[model samples]
Target chain A: MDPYKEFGATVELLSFLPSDFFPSVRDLLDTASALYREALESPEHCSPHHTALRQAILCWGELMTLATWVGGNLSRDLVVSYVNTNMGLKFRQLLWFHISCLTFGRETVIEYLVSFGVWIRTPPAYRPPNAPILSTLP
Target chain B: MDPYKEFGATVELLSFLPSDFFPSVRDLLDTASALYREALESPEHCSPHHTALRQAILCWGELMTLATWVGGNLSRDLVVSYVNTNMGLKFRQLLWFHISCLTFGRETVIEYLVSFGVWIRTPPAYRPPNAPILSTLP
Candidate 1:
């Protein structure tokens, strides 16, 4: 199965949590993915001309999803409860999971960007010429 | 000023955020500090024990506060706005802060616990024998 499909599945599982817990992981992921794809398809919009923009964004989201799910259970309610109750063991477990996932995700992003000659570079200061336009004209 | 007093003063700064953001943090820090003092003075309850417990609880609260703040910033109506509209980046920054605070706070607790000979050597399954007596009975 495509990694993106796996992410959708993971997100569906996350949705079982109370509405108050995760608010909108599925929506956020879906929106990010769509925005990412749209940006990829419109090269005129994605300037800096990396030529690998589409692949990079898709890869970035896919990798982040995988890292988050595989790093831990991805049970959103469990995370919320652990934090709320101050369950020490569970807290450490969640933190470790997040750390592991972030380390893997960061590495995945860097590796993808490097392959495309788009370095991870410093904090993104200058907006890329092809940066996706986020807001519609009001 | 005493270190504990400094800590309490620092925590009061959290009230600067929106009212909704204040309750969980204010309650947790207040309870933790109060409990810490209680445990310190109680002939039956070891200061180290209370400190460790409060450290864990407050750290958990800190983690949750950051998570909630990020969520509120991303989707909720912001009292203010800035160019950084990407909630993902905002969440990352908050997560980093949470982890940093957790790490630093644990060091103080760990040092105290170590001096008292209870650090991690306390059995994973062990529960304090005197915990029940310390609480006020209904």
Candidate 2:
């Protein structure tokens, strides 16, 4: 089977896991963290398997964010452990970035993320001079 | 006010905008694409300003992903243009990488992302000999 297809299937299955099945955000984190570590140890880390692992980690991150949206708390230790890992540095950083934005507000982490060059530091005060007018929805 | 604080405040405000206000995902993409191009044209592209611009781009990317999850379809031209920008190469690549994974499925884009070393191409198959045992959640 195509690895990406396999991964897609896995992500679809995991995405539907009942929210309450997690019991606590830590439970969800534990699962994702373990899967990430497993992927890191695989020789296929650069292959479709690693991509699957990333999706799995991201899925958990989204779920955790949803959980927090409704008042669930993250396990600090698990978050620290996952971010400190050598594998998935970008994924870990992005995940933590979003989590921090939600947990402590984006202002708190934008500077830190900026230092990593994962985010821009000073945006233009207005739209570019020749840019098309976009919807003023926001 | 601190740049991070301002950026954070901006993100908070934007996140609260009604989804329907977007009308089309292209509006969202166009806005981000223009901001990124503006940042790239700035003389301060190599400085803190660049970082700020990158964060702004990331903010839009997050919003776009949320919009897509709720049924919004992205413009391929915008995705391609954003990914091909020279400024914030790593950030652009990562953003497009995720967008590709979500829009086209992971199996389709993993190899391309691996070429950029954004993902490990060959991970180990089993736990490292002395690895710690994590929770058996999965």
Best by lDDT: 2
Q: Which candidate achieves the best DockQ against the true structure?
A: 2
lDDT (CA) for every model shown?
0.32, 0.35
**A8-116, model 2: which lDDT tens digit per residue?**
2222323333232223345435544544555434434333333333443443354344323323221334333433242233334334433333344444444433332
CAPRI-style class, candidate 1: incorrect
Interface RMSD of each: 25.4, 17.2
Q: Note the DockQ of each predicted structure.
A: 0.01, 0.02
What's model 1's lDDT at B113? Answer: 27
Under the 3 Å rule for N, CA and C atoms, how many clashes does model 2 have? 22
TM-score of 2: 0.23
Candidate chain B TM-scores, in order: 0.24, 0.25
Off by over 4 Å in 2: A1-18, A34-38, A41-43, A46-49, A56-138, B1-91, B95-138
Residues A1-138, candidate 1: write the lDDT tens digits: 111121122223322222332223344334434444444344232222112222223323432442343234324444444433433332332222222223344234333324323322323664354423222234
